[PDB]
Amino acid sequence: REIVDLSHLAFDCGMLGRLKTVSWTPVIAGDSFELDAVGALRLSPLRRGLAIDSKVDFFTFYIPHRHVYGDQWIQFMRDGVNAQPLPSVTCNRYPDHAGYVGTIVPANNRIPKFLHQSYLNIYNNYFRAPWMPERTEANPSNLNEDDARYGFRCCHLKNIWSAPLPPETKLAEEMGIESNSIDIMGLQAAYAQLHTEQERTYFMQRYRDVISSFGGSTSYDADNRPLLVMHTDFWASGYDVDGTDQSSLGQFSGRVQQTFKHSVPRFFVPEHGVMMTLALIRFPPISPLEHHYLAGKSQLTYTDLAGDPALIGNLPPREISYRDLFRDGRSGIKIKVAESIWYRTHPDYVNFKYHDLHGFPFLDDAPGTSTGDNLQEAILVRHQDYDACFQSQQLLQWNKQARYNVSVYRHMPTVRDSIMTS
């Protein structure tokens, strides 16, 4: 039960919408793990001055190796010094193609399963929309160029068009009825049943959440969810650099440079596993093309304008399309929003003029404009959408460097003891 010093530096960088691992540490059952990270985060040089600050999120999860290797792990630990070695997973034969899990692809082109599987588990349990397809690549080598190097894509910050009710939301519930009569008792049950269905669709799609519904609870082992140990978030601001020569005089370049601390309070590691810490930089989806929902409606009806409570609480969801929110909105992208939601929140505004000035991190094209009539593709952040505003991604879009001070108490014979025989 002595101290092991695992502190270390980390220089990293990535694409906008994608979730990248910035530091992982293997731990052992019985370990007491504490982590205090501190550093600075920056963005590649901007074409113009500063406009809006990006929002940065840092996470640190704990994942039991058992969650990865399954029964195979249990045997491993059980059989002890007789265990059949754990298998490695494969990566594409390229240095960077392991980037998502924070490591260079080693000489043999394969990395420990716990890195890959954890990243997956983390993504599937907290980052993707609950209704989106569960991410299930088997090997880092099954990942595509972008994903493998920069991490998976995550959802845009929540707004009316990026947080629609799950696409399969019921818009009407049918109930059969005998040719001339209706069982009012059945109708009653019908509603009840519906209620359970809705609650589920709207917010209890995950087992754990259903059980919470009953006022019960579930261990993280129940559904194999990575354990979130610490979540930090902050805005990334900086300064402008003044141009001073004959032609650059009166010009500006935004240099974003933000300092930040991410500290995990002493945590007890019950079983062997990994402590992964990842980052995610995003820009609120402002767009000179989005307009208030009501500004777009052609026939304004009492139900739209009035804001009559009696109606707002008993109507079904409303199906509308991106065309109804952005001028160049794609009509093929349908979303189901809650009635009179446009009266519950206001959207950001950008004069159409900024629409074509390179250097602003605004979405100068309605979301999903180049991914086709596909909702998921519009919701997930497309990092290219930002290529336009950077002088040059020599270090991708963002980048950072920080010191990770890690102290871990654990049973560990001194190096002297290891190297000495008698």
């Binding site: 101290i3 010093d5 501190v38 550093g39 010191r403 001070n405 102290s407 190096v415 002297r416």
Partner: peptide
Amino acid sequence: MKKARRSPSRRKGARLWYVGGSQF
């Protein structure tokens, strides 16, 4: 962003490097 420029010392804990004697 003071520490972030300098690689930690790993001064906490016991001795790790045995290399035959003192080496600067």
